[PDB]
Amino acid sequence: MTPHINAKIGDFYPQCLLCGDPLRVSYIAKKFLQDAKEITNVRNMLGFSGKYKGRGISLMGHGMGIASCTIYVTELIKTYQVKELLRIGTCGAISPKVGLKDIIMATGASTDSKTNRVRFLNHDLSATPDFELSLRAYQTAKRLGIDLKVGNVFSSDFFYSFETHAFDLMAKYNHLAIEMEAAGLYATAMELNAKALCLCSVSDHLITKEALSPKERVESFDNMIILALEMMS
Amino acid sequence: MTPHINAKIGDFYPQCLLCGDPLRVSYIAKKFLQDAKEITNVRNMLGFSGKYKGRGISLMGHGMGIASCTIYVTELIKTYQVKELLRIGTCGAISPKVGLKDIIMATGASTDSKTNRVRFLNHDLSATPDFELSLRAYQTAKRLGIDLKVGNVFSSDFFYSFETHAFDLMAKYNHLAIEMEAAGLYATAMELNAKALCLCSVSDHLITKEALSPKERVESFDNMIILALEMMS
Amino acid sequence: MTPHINAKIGDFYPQCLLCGDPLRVSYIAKKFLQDAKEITNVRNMLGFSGKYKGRGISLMGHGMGIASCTIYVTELIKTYQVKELLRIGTCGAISPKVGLKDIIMATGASTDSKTNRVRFLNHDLSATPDFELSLRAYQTAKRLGIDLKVGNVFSSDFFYSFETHAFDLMAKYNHLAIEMEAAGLYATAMELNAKALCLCSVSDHLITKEALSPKERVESFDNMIILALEMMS
Amino acid sequence: MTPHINAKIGDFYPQCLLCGDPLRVSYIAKKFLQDAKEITNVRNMLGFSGKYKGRGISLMGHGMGIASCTIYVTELIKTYQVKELLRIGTCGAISPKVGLKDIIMATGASTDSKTNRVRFLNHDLSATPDFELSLRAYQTAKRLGIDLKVGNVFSSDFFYSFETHAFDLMAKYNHLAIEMEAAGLYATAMELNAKALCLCSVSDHLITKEALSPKERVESFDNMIILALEMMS
Amino acid sequence: MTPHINAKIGDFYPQCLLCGDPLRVSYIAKKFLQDAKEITNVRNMLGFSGKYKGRGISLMGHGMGIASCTIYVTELIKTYQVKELLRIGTCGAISPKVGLKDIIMATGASTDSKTNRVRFLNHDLSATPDFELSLRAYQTAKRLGIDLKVGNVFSSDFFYSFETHAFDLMAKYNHLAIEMEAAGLYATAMELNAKALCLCSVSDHLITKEALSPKERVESFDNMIILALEMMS
Amino acid sequence: MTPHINAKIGDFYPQCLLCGDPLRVSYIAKKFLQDAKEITNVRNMLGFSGKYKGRGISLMGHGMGIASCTIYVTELIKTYQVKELLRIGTCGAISPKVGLKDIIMATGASTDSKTNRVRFLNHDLSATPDFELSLRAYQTAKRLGIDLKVGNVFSSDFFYSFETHAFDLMAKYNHLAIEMEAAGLYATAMELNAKALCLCSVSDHLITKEALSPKERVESFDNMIILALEMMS
Ligand SMILES: Nc1ncnc2c([C@@H]3O[C@H](CO)[C@@H](O)[C@H]3O)n[nH]c12
Ligand SMILES: Nc1ncnc2c([C@@H]3O[C@H](CO)[C@@H](O)[C@H]3O)n[nH]c12
Ligand SMILES: Nc1ncnc2c([C@@H]3O[C@H](CO)[C@@H](O)[C@H]3O)n[nH]c12
Ligand SMILES: Nc1ncnc2c([C@@H]3O[C@H](CO)[C@@H](O)[C@H]3O)n[nH]c12
Ligand SMILES: Nc1ncnc2c([C@@H]3O[C@H](CO)[C@@H](O)[C@H]3O)n[nH]c12
Ligand SMILES: Nc1ncnc2c([C@@H]3O[C@H](CO)[C@@H](O)[C@H]3O)n[nH]c12
Check whether F24 is labelled as a binding-site residue. yes
Nearest CA in chain A to D116: A124
Nearest to C131 among B107, B111, B170 (CB): B107
Nearest to A121 among D117, D134, D169 (CB): D169
**For helices B131-143 and C131-144, angle between their N-to-C axes, nearest 10 degrees:** 90
Measure the CA–CA gap between E141 and E134, rounded to whole angstroms.
11
H or E element at residue F68: helix F66-78
**Chain F: touching chains (3 or more CB pairs < 8 Å):** D, E
Using the atom order of ligand 4, give the atom closest to the CA of residue F4.
Answer: 12
Are A86 and A160 contacting, i.e. CB atoms less than 8 angstroms apart?
Answer: no
D218 and A CB contact within 8 Å: no
Ligand 5 center from residue E179 Cα (angstroms): 5
Nearest to E124 among F110, F135, F169 (CB): F110
**Chain D nearest CA to A133, separation (Å):** 12
Are F18 and F184 contacting, i.e. CB atoms less than 8 angstroms apart?
Answer: no
Measure the CA–CA gap between B201 and B103, rounded to whole angstroms.
5
Distances (CA, A) of A157 to A19, A185, B180, D195, E36: 17, 14, 13, 29, 62
**SS3 string of D152-200?**
EEEECCCCCCCCHHHHHHHHHCCEEEEECCHHHHHHHHHHCCCEEEEEE
Q: Which residues pair with A88 in a beta bridge?
A: A199
Find out whether the beta carbon of F199 lies less than 6 Å from any atom of ligand 6.
Answer: no
Ligand 4 center from residue D17 Cα (angstroms): 17
Point out the annotated binding site of C for a purine D-ribonucleoside.
4, 179-181, 203-204
Specify the amino acid at residue F6. N
User: What 3-state DSSP class applies to D35?
Assistant: strand
Cβ separation of D166 and A135 shorter than 8 Å?
A: no
CATH number of C1-233: 3.40.50.1580
Measure the CA–CA gap between A167 and A178, rounded to whole angstroms.
9
Are B106 and B152 contacting, i.e. CB atoms less than 8 angstroms apart?
Answer: yes
**Chain D nearest CA to A40, separation (Å):** 29
Are B148 and B224 contacting, i.e. CB atoms less than 8 angstroms apart?
Answer: no
Measure the CA–CA gap between E3 and D100, rounded to whole angstroms.
69
Measure the CA–CA gap between E120 and A27, rounded to whole angstroms.
54
Are E176 and E95 contacting, i.e. CB atoms less than 8 angstroms apart?
Answer: yes
Find out whether the beta carbon of D156 lies less than 6 Å from any atom of ligand 4.
Answer: no
Report chain A's C-alpha Rg in angstroms.
Answer: 17
Nearest CA in chain A to B27: A43
Longest dimension (CA), chain E: 48
The closest of D86, D68, D108 to A124, measured between CA atoms, is D108
Using the atom order of ligand 5, give the atom closest to the CA of residue E69.
Answer: 14
Method of elucidation: X-ray
With a CB cutoff of 8 Å and minimum separation 6, the contacts of E145 are none
Mutation choice for E interface testing from C43, C48, C69, C77 by most E CBs within 10 A: C43
The resolution in Å comes to: 2.3
Find out whether the beta carbon of E20 lies less than 6 Å from any atom of ligand 5.
Answer: yes
∠ CA D103-D109-D112 to the nearest 5 degrees?
125
Check whether A217 is labelled as a binding-site residue. no
Point out the annotated binding site of D for phosphate.
20, 24, 43, 87-90
Residue C136: CB atoms within 10 A of its CB come to 18
Specify the amino acid at residue A156. S
The closest of F61, F34, F32, F37 to F49, measured between CA atoms, is F37
Measure the CA–CA gap between D161 and A121, rounded to whole angstroms.
13
Are C153 and B177 contacting, i.e. CB atoms less than 8 angstroms apart?
Answer: no
Mutation choice for E interface testing from C44, C154, C163 by most E CBs within 10 A: C44
Find out whether the beta carbon of E92 lies less than 6 Å from any atom of ligand 5.
Answer: yes
The single-letter DSSP state of residue E206 is T
Find out whether the beta carbon of F155 lies less than 6 Å from any atom of ligand 6.
Answer: no
Residue A209: CB atoms within 10 A of its CB come to 7
Measure the CA–CA gap between A182 and A175, rounded to whole angstroms.
13
- Which one is catalytic: E11, E112, E204, E222? E204
Specify the amino acid at residue C60. M
Specify the amino acid at residue D228. A
C89 and E CB contact within 8 Å: no
Distances (CA, A) of B193 to B80, B84, B130, B189, E220: 14, 10, 10, 6, 58
Q: Count Cα neighbours of F29 within 13 Å in the Cβ-side half-sphere.
A: 24
**SS3 string of E41-60?**
CHHHCCEEEEEECCEEEEEE
Find out whether the beta carbon of B94 lies less than 6 Å from any atom of ligand 2.
Answer: no
The closest of F156, C137, B219 to F164, measured between CA atoms, is F156
The single-letter DSSP state of residue F5 is B
A38 and B CB contact within 8 Å: no
Q: C-alpha C82: how far from its chain's center? A: 15
Ligand 1 center from residue A97 Cα (angstroms): 19
Are B81 and B154 contacting, i.e. CB atoms less than 8 angstroms apart?
Answer: no
Measure the CA–CA gap between F217 and F233, rounded to whole angstroms.
26
D188 and F CB contact within 8 Å: no
Ligand 3 center from residue C192 Cα (angstroms): 25
User: What 3-state DSSP class applies to A63?
Assistant: coil
Find out whether the beta carbon of F179 lies less than 6 Å from any atom of ligand 6.
Answer: yes
Cβ separation of B68 and A65 shorter than 8 Å?
A: yes
> What burial class does residue D123 get, using C-beta atoms within 10 Å of its C-beta: 0-12 exposed, 13-18 middle, 19+ buried?
buried
Which of left, alpha, beta for B26 (phi over 0: left; psi -120 to 50: alpha)?
alpha
Q: What is the DSSP string of B95-161?
A: STT--TT-EEEEEEEEES-SHHHHHTTTSB------HHHHHHHHHHHHHTT--EEEEEEEE-S-SS-
- Residue of the CA atom closest to atom 15 of ligand 3: C179
User: Which phi and psi angles does F82 have, rounded to 5°?
Assistant: -65, 140
Would you list the domain boundaries of chain B?
A: 1-233
The single-letter DSSP state of residue F42 is G
Report chain C's C-alpha Rg in angstroms.
Answer: 17
Cβ separation of A43 and B65 shorter than 8 Å?
A: no
Check whether B134 is labelled as a binding-site residue. no
* Closest-approaching ligand to the CA atom of F67: 4
Q: Using a threshold of 3 CB pairs under 8 A, tell whether chains E and F touch.
A: yes
Q: Count Cα neighbours of D186 within 13 Å in the Cβ-side half-sphere.
A: 33
Nearest CA in chain D to F157: D67
User: Which phi and psi angles does B145 have, rounded to 5°?
Assistant: 65, 25
User: Which phi and psi angles does D53 have, rounded to 5°?
Assistant: 50, 50
H or E element at residue F148: strand F148-155
Nearest to C121 among B131, B169, B190 (CB): B169
- Residue of the CA atom closest to atom 17 of ligand 3: C179
Check whether F201 is labelled as a binding-site residue. no
The C-alpha torsion from B46 through B49 and B52 to B54, rounded to 10°, is -170
Cβ separation of B63 and A63 shorter than 8 Å?
A: yes
Distances (CA, A) of C174 to B115, B122, E140, E151: 17, 17, 54, 45
Are D125 and A110 contacting, i.e. CB atoms less than 8 angstroms apart?
Answer: yes
The C-alpha torsion from F225 through F231 and F232 to F233, rounded to 10°, is 120
With a CB cutoff of 8 Å and minimum separation 6, the contacts of C73 are C18, C62, C85, C184, C185, C188, C189, C196
Ligand 2 center from residue D54 Cα (angstroms): 64
Q: How many residues does chain D have?
A: 233
Check whether E4 is labelled as a binding-site residue. yes
* Closest-approaching ligand to the CA atom of A21: 1
Specify the amino acid at residue E64. M
Active site residue B204: yes
Check whether F40 is labelled as a binding-site residue. no
The closest of D131, D151, D149 to D141, measured between CA atoms, is D149
Are D177 and D74 contacting, i.e. CB atoms less than 8 angstroms apart?
Answer: no
